[PDB]
Amino acid sequence: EDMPVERILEAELAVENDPVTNICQAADKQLFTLVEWAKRIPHFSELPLDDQVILLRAGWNELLIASFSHRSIAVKDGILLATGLHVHRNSAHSAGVGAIFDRVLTELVSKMRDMQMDKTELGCLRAIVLFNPDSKGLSNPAEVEALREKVYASLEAYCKHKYPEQPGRFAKLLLRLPALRSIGLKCLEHLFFFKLIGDTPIDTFLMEMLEAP
């Protein structure tokens, strides 16, 4: 099929002190495993390099935020990082980042937990985020627009097939994307401030993503 869920799900299963230091330490880390994820996404690796750079530089945060949010469906009040480290609500509040942390927990983590969003649904959402035709500088946004469209057409079919009892499910999923977008930008601000004040060590790959075009 033109945009198979299975290959998008396969991409999800393939990569699968100061808390802010840990969160920044896990971020740089995931960045490498996000490149590897994207490569395993249908048609992505066939887009021109420049457009592949533009997409990941534009999406990483949302793409990364979604991941940890969905990995954290399991924990009561905290988030689980890929370093195997858990950041608790209270630990994040004690570090002065409780405001955003809570928004991740209620708007993403909780709403993921509520609707028992499966890894396929999560993968296709991230694949929709990955294929953001609104990205600036893209050589071919009409090909990005088409790819995203393939992804979410496949996502409707799956949602109609897997959970046919819930007719509002397909929309409900997409309707976490304005939230992820909001949370991405708020979260990104924090990074820029962690850098400005230089209080927190930021590793090379993470540094590269914050640093100017």
């Binding site: 490498f32 490149v35 590897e36 490569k39 390099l49 592949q52 750079v53 990941l56 530089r57 090379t204 790959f205 590269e208 993503m209 640093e211």
Partner: peptide, 10 residues
């Protein structure tokens, strides 16, 4: 932006 380009190559 070095690192990214090197990685988007197998």
């Amino acid at each position: 932006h070095k690192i990214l380009h090197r990685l988007l190559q197998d």
